[PDB]
Design a protein around this ligand. Structure first.
Ligand SMILES: C#Cc1ccc(Nc2c(C(=O)NOCCO)cc(/C=N/OCCO)c(F)c2F)c(F)c1
Ligand SMILES: Nc1ncnc2c1ncn2[C@@H]1O[C@H](COP(=O)(O)OP(=O)(O)OP(=O)(O)O)[C@@H](O)[C@H]1O
Ligand SMILES: [Mg+2]
Length: 272
């Protein structure tokens, strides 16, 4: 029940490849929500299938997944209306914070591996694009995941995804088609490491960045705590089967001392 005209544009939270979200007002309910607009050059049939498989998001309910209000089509634009996250993305936070704690990243990590196990064990789907620009947090202290693959057809229309300048892509997934869930870990790994070093931990046009990632060894860290090495790295193992699976890390030592401890996060964000 969300039509294009019951929407009033306020600003522009951000953009990217094919997408571009805005902060908008749903005129008829007064609610403030983020309106993603993917474009994609697709036909009516495939499109309707994308708009259809996107309804699954009404059953994607968890403190770790961004809230979703509706999805629909309008002028070559697939709209995905999700909750507004005033606190932006752990990417934006970065750009304005040089680097992030650990007592904190241990919290941003519980978010992620609890939101991944959710998507994997209640919707049988892997994220497939977990990274900072896709990890959002709110002023209320919450941390949630967004932009995950929920529409198989949307994942097929996004085939030309090896563009950009960075790449949270695991090695086995850059080599060919031998990959799945374990790939999300290398992603989260290459994230935690970047949210501890204020810059893409790797080490050059993308064709060369890719080749490098599969050839030489995975990043580590510069200076940094305990487990945040025996975790950031149990995440960067280039062999997918030797890397740690969610089950494991959900009991790993770094995680051990964290949901146990009591960091605020809220205030840190609110004042960072
Ligand atoms: C809550 C919630 C929520 C969950 C998901 C999305 N959006 C996507 C995006 C998505 O939005 N990606 O951002 C790009 C658009 O600019 C990409 C894919 C496809 N994956 O194919 C590329 C990986 O190989 C997909 F299937 C999606 F459903 C969302 F907007 C909100
Ligand atoms: N619910 C939301 N609330 C507030 N900001 C959001 C929300 N969803 C996405 N954003 C922000 O909107 C912007 C665009 O997101 P988008 O997914 O299109 O780009 P991206 O993830 O940065 O890059 P890419 O297209 O390569 O994945 C980002 O700056 C992101 O943090
Ligand atoms: Mg995103």
């Amino acid at each position: 029940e969300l039509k294009d005209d019951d929407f009033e544009k306020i600003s522009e939270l951000g953009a990217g490849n094919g997408g571009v979200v805005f902060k908008v007002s749903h005129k008829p309910s007064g609610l403030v929500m983020a309106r993603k607009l993917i474009h994609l050059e697709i036909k009516p049939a495939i499109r309707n299938q994308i708009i259809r498989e996107l309804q699954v998001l009404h059953e994607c309910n968890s403190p770790y997944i961004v809230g979703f209000y509706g999805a629909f089509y309008s002028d070559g634009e697939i709209s995905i209306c999700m909750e507004h996250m005033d606190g932006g993305s752990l990417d934006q936070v970065l750009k304005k914070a040089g680097r992030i704690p650990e007592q904190i990243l241990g919290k941003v990590s519980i978010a992620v591996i609890k939101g991944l196990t959710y998507l994997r064990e209640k919707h049988k789907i892997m994220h497939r694009d977990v990274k900072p620009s896709n990890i959002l947090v709110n002023s209320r202290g919450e941390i949630k995941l967004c932009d995950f693959g929920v529409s198989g057809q949307l994942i097929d229309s996004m085939a030309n995804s090896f563009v950009g300048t960075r790449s949270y892509m695991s090695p086995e997934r850059l080599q060919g088609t031998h990959y799945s869930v374990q790939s999300d870990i290398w992603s989260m790994g290459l994230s935690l490491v970047e949210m501890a070093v204020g810059r893409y931990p790797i080490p050059m046009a993308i064709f060369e960045l890719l080749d490098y990632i599969v050839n030489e060894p995975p990043p580590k860290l510069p200076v940094f705590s305990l487990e945040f090495q025996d975790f950031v790295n149990k995440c960067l193992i280039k062999n997918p089967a030797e890397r740690a699976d969610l089950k494991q890390l959900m009991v790993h030592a770094f995680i051990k001392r964290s949901d146990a401890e009591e960091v605020d996060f809220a205030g840190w964000l609110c004042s960072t």
